[PDB]
């Protein structure tokens, strides 16, 4: 293939106001509005271009570990250690203090205006209907806590990572697990699909990234260097697919070649562990959040 070598990846903005560590962010479908919340009990919806606090939502549970922004830009989701997923109507008050999980929440991603898939510390991923108020299906089959969750870019299947160095591809419609993948040594900290929808990439605290597919149903390839030792906090993707990303505990976001199997860039500018990382739905620019409370928007 033709290597891309290095990419001069430069910041374009910095976002301030959070009073503690950022735990997760989400890129909207219009790329303009971003949502991220901290461990001080504050959600904020940011104007990503202009750096304007569009909204600052307080939280009842200051121990919060996942956030979501609806694909229709209508709602947001907020989950944390109090086990209740709050669905917030932006048009901001609680739409549904929607509950049903036992473990702490780790990742929730809307399917439409009405359905939400949640991962928790109960080791079971639950698909919920906000209108009904209760679960509409529940996926089991994992052992460790499902910390990572990523939707397919067709709203039909999803992947979950569960602290046991394995991931489950499950079908939303069938309500069951379709395939399982291994290859790691530690927790699955974050997982994401390849934007086409026939492959996905995994990050684990064993300082190793991996890329599998649902077509061949085997570990396609892996990403690792001897000088990297911290755990992959988060991953994302670029539309082309020649790149993937990986936030790290070692203070920086390493951007690697998704095919040539070599590092292609490093984003510094973070004073603490990198906890959040997303790519806009049009591929314009990455955003990362770290325990600094400083979200910044690379490009």
């Amino acid at each position: 293939i033709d290597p891309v070598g290095r990419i001069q990846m430069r910041t374009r903005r910095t976002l301030r106001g959070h009073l503690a560590k950022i735990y997760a962010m989400h890129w909207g479908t219009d790329s303009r509005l971003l949502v991220s919340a901290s461990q001080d009990g504050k959600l904020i919806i940011w104007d990503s271009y202009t750096t304007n606090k569009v909204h600052a939502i307080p939280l009842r549970s200051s121990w919060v570990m996942t956030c979501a922004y609806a694909p229709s830009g209508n709602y947001v989701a907020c989950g944390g250690l109090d086990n209740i997923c709050s669905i917030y109507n932006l048009k901001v008050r609680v739409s549904r203090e929607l509950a049903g999980h036992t473990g702490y929440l780790s990742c929730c991603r809307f399917l439409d205006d009405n359905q939400i898939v949640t991962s928790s510390g109960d080791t079971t991923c639950a698909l919920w209907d906000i209108e009904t108020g209760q679960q509409t299906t529940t996926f089991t089959g994992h052992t460790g806590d499902v910390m990572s969750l990523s939707l397919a870019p067709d709203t039909r299947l999803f992947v979950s990572g569960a602290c046991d160095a394995s991931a489950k591809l499950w079908d939303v419609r069938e309500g069951m697990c379709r395939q399982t993948f291994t290859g790691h040594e530690s927790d699955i900290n974050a997982i994401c699909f390849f934007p086409n929808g026939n492959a996905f990439a995994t990050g684990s605290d064993d300082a190793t990234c991996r890329l599998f597919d649902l077509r061949a149903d085997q570990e396609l390839m892996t990403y690792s260097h001897d000088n990297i030792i911290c755990g992959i906090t988060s991953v994302s993707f670029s539309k082309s697919g020649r790149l993937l990303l990986a936030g790290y505990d070692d203070f920086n976001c390493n951007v690697w070649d998704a095919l040539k199997a070599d590092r292609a860039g490093v984003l510094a500018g973070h004073d603490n562990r990198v906890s959040c990382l997303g790519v806009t739905d049009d591929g314009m620019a990455v955003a990362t959040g770290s325990w600094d409370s400083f979200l910044k928007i690379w490009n």
Binding site: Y49, N196, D213, A216, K239, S240, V255, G283, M284
Partner: peptide, 29 residues
């Protein structure tokens, strides 16, 4: 494998990370 390479080849044109764009089509610049 090969399908991923074809997808990379076909959709590289809309990747403001693989091909950074000047301020003409760059809202962040």
């Amino acid at each position: 494998a090969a399908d991923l390479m074809a997808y990379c080849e076909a959709h590289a044109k809309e990747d403001p990370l693989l091909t950074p764009v000047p301020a003409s089509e760059n809202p962040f610049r």
